Ligand SMILES: CC(=O)Nc1cccc(-c2nc(C(=O)O)c(O)c(=O)[nH]2)c1
């Protein structure tokens with residue numbers, strides 16, 4: 001699984017996933033499923049940011065925490081939007097909202113509701129993808145065009161297959177419930 005991740009995702013994403021795990025004192029060598037999930041989520045976040053017109057999205061995720069807060073602060077003080085209680089993943093300049101991107105090996109609506117109650121925010125848009133082609137977004141407002149969302153769905157289903165063909169998918173799918181509980 002470790003070797004799969006390092007050859008499945010680009011080095012910059014891997015690099016960012018390792019740092020993110022190290023900042024919490026976890027070992028990517030041991031917790032390989034979380035390592036995969038982190039890289040996947042990052043990859044989705046960057047695909048998403050790319051889905052829009054050139055300067056539409058501020059990227060919050062993938063940054064060191066402190067600088068991430070500084071940027072959020074800057075957007076809040078300059079747009080009027082309320083300060084979220086937790087770090088979101090992006091800010092949409094077109095729609096004037098933050099976005100939380102979720103990626104789940106379980107049901108989109110279950111994950112959506114976990115996100116929505118943790119944040120307790122009526123401003124932050126939530127957008128969940130699954131490894132089975134579905135998506136759920138706040139108010140059924142998907143933000144991007146179908147083309148950009150479709151590319152992401154395809155990439156996720158390709159990760160699932162490459163996992164399965166290596167015997168890694170079961171453990172990866174099962175793992176999320178364990179993480180939750
Ligand atoms: C789950 C996912 O792909 N998104 C995402 C982003 C950042 C972190 C995690 C995450 N993923 C797992 C996991 O094992 O799946 C955890 O146990 C955990 O604490 N966090 C997941």
Ligand SMILES: CC(=O)Nc1cccc(-c2nc(C(=O)O)c(O)c(=O)[nH]2)c1
Nearest residue numbers: 041061087089101102103114176179180
């Ligand atoms: C709830 C769950 O199943 N996994 C999990 C656990 C802890 C954290 C995260 C997570 N964490 C972040 C984060 O920014 O830390 C995300 O953007 C995200 O989508 N998911 C996901």
Ligand SMILES: [Mn+2]
Nearest residue numbers: 061087088089
């Ligand atoms: Mn995040």
Ligand SMILES: [Mn+2]
Nearest residue numbers: 089100101102
């Ligand atoms: Mn997220």
